[PDB]
């Protein structure tokens, strides 16, 4: 519950193919919000899933997405799916019943992602 | 932990399109194992996901699969994915890092599913 219970406020879970976009999101988020690219030993309050064509094709990415949602946004943790570079028709069906940010929104979805992160940080002590 | 902590030993989570196959699995499982088709108020020790073309296309099915795995086979609960009537190339990428039963196995995968269920029941008091 403590804002300091975790070293980072948000990390970006991405596939190698989208390194650049992920770095821009991290940059956008930090402009305070502490951000980084997600990694094995990475632990933050919020986790952004950069769901792209490369992400959906990668078995490890999909499994990570699964674990990200395993213990997260049901309503407890903070997992933010960001659909980027994908046709809506190719979106994972389950998202229809879940919260997510569309990449066609303002700032490629970056703005709503940052907002979602802040909303969650405000609920911390 | 108690074998009686739940009224059913296993329910079959399926899409309307596969009612028949689901009923045969339920029949096969019971031949003791108490089985039924999963429903809203349904709660059992094991949950079998009848992942078919219709299942993967259905947003609610996918969301249910997500919740089924939300609090389940990470290693705690009992969720058994049964891939039936699908080309391996169309399998959800995440399964590569997960346990699942292929429908091309003995008895359309029914045998290994039943075995998985029994293995789990034996760990109960």
Numbering used by the authors:
A (entry chain A), B (entry chain A): 79 to 109, 128 to 221
Please, what does the article write about this entry?
The crystal structure of human Mal-TIR (residues 79–221) was determined at a resolution of 2.4 Å using the single wavelength anomalous dispersion method. The protein crystals were found to belong to the space group P43212 and to contain one molecule per asymmetric unit. In comparison with the TIR domain of MyD88, Mal-TIR has an unusually long AB loop (residues 109–129) and lacks the αB helix and the BB loop. The crystals of Valkov et al. were obtained in a solution containing 10–12% PEG 10,000, 5% PEG 3,350, 0.2 M NaCl, 0.1 M Tris-HCl (pH 7.3), and 20 mM DTT and diffracted to 3.0 Å resolution, while the crystals for this study were grown in n-cyclohexyl-2-aminoethanesulfonic acid (CHES) (pH 9.5), 150–300 mM NaCl, 10–20% glycerol and 10 mM DTT and diffracted to 2.4 Å resolution. Both structures of Mal-TIR identified the unusually long AB loop instead of the helix αB and BB loops in other known TIR domains and included two disulfide bonds (residues C89–C134 and C142–C174) and an additional DTT molecule that linked two cysteine residues, Cys91 and Cys157. Based on our Mal-TIR crystal structure, two possible interfaces (green-magenta, referred to as the symmetric dimer; green-yellow, referred to as the asymmetric dimer) mediate Mal homodimerization. The buried surface area, calculated by AREAIMOL, is 700 Å2 for the symmetric dimer and 500 Å2 for the asymmetric dimer. The interactions within the interface of the symmetric dimer primarily involve residues of the αC′ and αD helices of both monomers. Our results showed that the W156A and Y159A mutations located within the interface of the symmetric dimer caused a significant loss of Mal homodimer formation, while mutants D87A and R192A did not affect homodimer formation, indicating that the symmetric dimer observed in the crystal structure is related to the Mal homodimer formed in solution. In this dimer, the AB loops of the two molecules are oriented in opposite directions, facilitating direct interaction with TLR4 and MyD88. We conclude that the AB loop of Mal-TIR plays an important role in TLR signaling through interacting with TLR4 and MyD88 simultaneously.
